[PDB]
């Protein structure tokens, strides 16, 4: 079959059941709470359209990595979309994608990637560096 779910935006999405049931949240609301239209307050059409795209498509997969080539805003959006929709898959991929953005050592560089102001006082930063020495 197929079921309809409503993003926060208010946009209904005709997404094949199972394909959408990849979101145990959506699944739970479909099989347990039974929502004619599955209201997904935490996910807007923009992202819900993205999770579905990811879901209707189901170590960082040789595709998910591209699909997540998107900017941080979206990534973050998906981390939540996934987390909210409880889509372990999407969540792992995205979160990892972020992690990978970190996997590269150098605090300074890690910041240049997530902005991040070095809010460490003189002594502090030192201490942090001494503690996370390597």
């Amino acid at each position: 079959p197929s079921i309809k779910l409503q993003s926060s935006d208010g946009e209904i999405f005709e997404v094949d059941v199972e394909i959408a049931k990849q979101s145990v949240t959506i699944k739970t609301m479909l099989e347990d709470l039974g929502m004619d239209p599955v209201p997904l307050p935490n996910v807007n059409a923009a992202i819900l359209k993205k999770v579905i795209q990811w879901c209707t498509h189901h170590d960082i997969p040789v595709w998910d990595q591209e699909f997540l080539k998107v900017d941080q805003g979206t990534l973050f959006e998906l981390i939540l979309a996934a987390n909210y929709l409880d889509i372990k898959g999407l969540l792992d991929v995205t979160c990892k994608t972020v992690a990978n953005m970190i996997k590269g050592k150098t605090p300074e560089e890690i910041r240049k990637t997530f902005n991040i102001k070095n809010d460490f006082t003189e002594e502090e930063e030192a201490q942090v560096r001494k503690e996370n020495q390597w």
Partner: protein, 441 residues
Amino acid sequence: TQVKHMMQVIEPQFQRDFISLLPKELALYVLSFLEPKDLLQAAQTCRYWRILAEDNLLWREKCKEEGIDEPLHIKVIKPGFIHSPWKSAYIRQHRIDTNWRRGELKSPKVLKGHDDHVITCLQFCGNRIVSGSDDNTLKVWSAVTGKCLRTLVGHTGGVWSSQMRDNIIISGSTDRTLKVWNAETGECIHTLYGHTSTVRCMHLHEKRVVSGSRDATLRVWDIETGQCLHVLMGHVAAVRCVQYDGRRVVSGAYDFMVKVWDPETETCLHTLQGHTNRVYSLQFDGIHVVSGSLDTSIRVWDVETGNCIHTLTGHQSLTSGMELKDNILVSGNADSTVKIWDIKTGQCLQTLQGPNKHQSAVTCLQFNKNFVITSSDDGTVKLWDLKTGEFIRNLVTLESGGSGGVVWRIRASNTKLVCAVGSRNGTEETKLLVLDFDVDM
């Protein structure tokens, strides 16, 4: 919790970064994908990140990753910081590992002992070191202080096999008798007679000690009762090595044979035939018996079938040392070579040679997931990268290693290295070198 508690106190508010905005949990589910190396870097990012990279449970795993299992709890500066018992426990290891690897050798605690004699066996059971010597004595030391705590005086023959299990030292001597000792009181609580020849080896397992002797018979002794529960007779030659997992008694005798025994019924369950010569070293993980012979080879047997599983060849001489762990075998060989094998695949994972290979015979070896510590007649205790098989450095380098100085046996704790150093000639006073690779935390 703990991570939450940190925020509500340090107040690292306002952060224009991806993870700082992610719900605490998700930011963690993210950082969790980072290897400790990264987390540590991520932790130097910003107070916020630091606080996250500090999630206790996050390391409890990264530790069970490096096999820590025990989180260290150090024991008062400005802006409090709830350190993760695991992150620190992890760093401790990383550092310990590092202190081992490139950590400056601190000038070891010399444990002058067994003057002009050979430390024929070494036991290292946390803080207590038990050096067995052919000077008929054993000395219980403090890897800690380095002071000789006791000298198990009792044997009339030289000690050649030793086993220990906290306060319970069991020594086997040429005098034909094992001797159970109280490492604390240094008193001989038992003198296991039954062996007519030299008690060459002995493997202790819980309350029992199977002893191998030149008498061709091994004897299972009750370390507690002092009784000799069993006598394994079936070896034509002398038993040089013995392994007792409590279930079976794998033995290696100069009879080229490796006998697997069911102590209980004094029955040689198996006679492992395959060594064209004296089997000197034995290893047994309850599943695979790894015999190491003077025949140059190391045969990986199937204790169950008795069927040789692998005939690990490569060494050019007598595989003296041999440590088996997780089906990974590291064989110390008189060929000055140490080899690391995957006794499952029979692959010779590594060979510890190289420009910094041992010059003379490898006498002992210790190894963990990270390194292989190898002692040699060359007076050097080398630290090798188990994984890469690369020589790392010489933890020890007897200035006499070449002029008679030698390192007979070594025992490595996760934090320190005990080395039985000495020489046939008076160039190295027999002693134990206790190198400490712990870290200030």
